[PDB]
């Protein structure tokens, strides 16, 4: 039927969005990361949705160790932590989750967070759609003896899209705005030798 190509199905099957290595870190949420998903999102102009993240953690070489961690979420308006022992890690306005490494991955959602009514992938004027910021650290006053690396998977639920626009063919240059290489424009299709075949 036609249900296999609906807008809900087209934005499912949560995939990798970022990989973090800690041989404290800050990773702001940005869907315009890997070019595979950026081109898919750039099809429409206005999109409204919410996410559901999942953190699978493990030391390098893959082995697991009994260590306790803390993932901390920061709303758009808040001071981000700047040290391993700041007051941000203790303020309670911004929630946090505690989970041991030898446990199932921590699953947590995040609602549609914006002063406007929908996200804007294209803004024509001058200064806006920040989604938050995650902070990861190992709980304890001393220094952890084990290196960790974690990868973040993100899903999209309750998707609504507006005002479709043409896709993109030129390679990307920056993660914030669409400048291309205006001297080596690559054509869309392949090339024949003479138009008879």
């Amino acid at each position: 039927s036609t249900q296999e190509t609906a807008i809900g199905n087209f934005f499912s099957r949560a995939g990798l969005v970022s990989i973090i290595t800690m041989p404290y870190v800050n990773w702001d949420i940005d869907l315009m990361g890997y070019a595979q998903l950026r081109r898919k999102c750039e099809l429409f102009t206005y999109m409204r949705f919410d996410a559901e993240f999942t953190f699978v953690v493990a030391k390098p070489n893959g082995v697991l160790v009994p260590q306790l961690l803390q993932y901390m979420y920061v709303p758009p308006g808040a001071p981000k932590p700047t040290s391993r022992d700041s007051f941000a890690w203790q303020t309670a306005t911004n929630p946090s989750v505690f989970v041991k490494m030898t446990d199932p991955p921590a699953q947590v959602s995040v609602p549609f967070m914006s002063p406007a009514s929908a996200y804007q992938w294209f803004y024509d004027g001058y200064p806006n759609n920040m989604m938050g910021t995650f902070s990861i650290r190992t709980v304890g006053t001393e220094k952890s003896p084990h290196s960790i690396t974690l990868r973040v998977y993100m899903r999209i639920k309750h998707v609504r899209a507006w005002i479709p626009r043409p896709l993109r063919n030129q390679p990307y240059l920056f993660k914030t705005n669409p400048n291309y290489k205006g001297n080596d424009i690559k054509c869309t299709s392949t090339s024949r030798d003479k138009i008879t075949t």
Binding site: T45, Y46, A116, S117, A118, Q120, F122, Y123, D124, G125, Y126, I163, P164, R165, P166, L167, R168, N169, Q170, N177, P178, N179, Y180, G182, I185, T188
Partner: protein
């Protein structure tokens, strides 16, 4: 008439007439900058008068939130019209509301565009662009007029 996305909005300002030569690339205007809290629609009207011995094909189409890679009343000229100067290819510009200005056939095209923004009410934000692209280059025999003018008429609708 063509209504953008099938939604009605709920004087006759005439801009300067650009000259279409035999090697022109295109033009575009930003709105509501070209007519210079805010909430209003528009009624774009483009006319291109030429003799019966000329040939060509224009493509006029709006594009909401058209970022580049403030012209004003005069307008601007595209540099690489194949990629619309923004990376998106011209060959799929037809997704947005559009019309054809085939000189062998009618020479007028009008588009009704309602308000399309993420907030109910809005001078620094430009809502949509208006692109005019000569898809088929214009040609004529020697001795005829070398420039064919195009006129753009803008009429605000349901302003507040």
């Amino acid at each position: 008439i063509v209504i953008a996305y099938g939604e009605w909005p709920e004087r006759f300002f005439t801009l300067d007439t650009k000259s279409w030569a035999k090697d022109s690339k295109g033009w575009y205007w930003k709105f509501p900058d070209v007519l210079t809290l805010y909430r209003s629609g528009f009624c774009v009207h483009v006319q291109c008068n030429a003799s019966k011995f000329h040939q060509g094909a224009l493509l006029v189409a709006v594009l909401p939130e058209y970022v580049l890679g403030q012209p004003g009343q005069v307008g601007a000229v595209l540099t690489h019209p194949y990629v619309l100067d923004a990376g998106i290819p011209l060959s799929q510009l037809t997704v947005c509301p559009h019309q054809w200005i085939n000189l062998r056939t009618n020479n007028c095209a009008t588009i009704i565009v309602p308000y399309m923004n993420t907030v109910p009410f809005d001078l620094n934000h430009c809502n949509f662009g208006l692109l005019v692209i000569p898809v088929v280059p214009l040609d004529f025999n020697a001795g005829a007029t070398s420039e064919i003018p195009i006129t753009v008429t803008i009429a605000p609708m349901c302003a507040e």
